[PDB]
Amino acid sequence: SEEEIREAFRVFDKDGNGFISAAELRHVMTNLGEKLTDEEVDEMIREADIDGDGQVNYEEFVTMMTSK
C-alpha cells in the first residue's frame, strides 16, 4: 500500500529532493505521450499543491492519491 505510493512518488520526484516540481511533472507527462502547455502543467501542480509553494511534497501527494 504505502510502499506503492512512496514508489509512485519517486517516479515523479526524479532528482529525489522530496518535492515534485513543474519541470519534473512536465518530464514525466511528456514521456507518457502528453503535449502540455506551461499552463496545463501548473494546473496539474495545483491538483495537489496545498501550501502553494508551486510543488508537490510527499504529504500533498498522499492526500491527492487517497481522496476521490
Binding site: 509512485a8 496539474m44 491538483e47 492519491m65
Partner: peptide
C-alpha cells in the same frame, strides 16, 4: 512501465485536463 500507483497519480494529475477534453 507505469507501476499502477503511478498510473493512478497520472489520472489524478490529469483531472482538469481530462474534464476540459471531455467538454471539447
Amino acid at each position: 512501465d507505469v507501476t499502477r500507483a503511478t498510473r493512478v497519480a497520472y489520472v489524478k494529475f490529469m483531472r482538469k485536463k481530462m474534464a476540459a477534453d471531455e467538454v471539447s
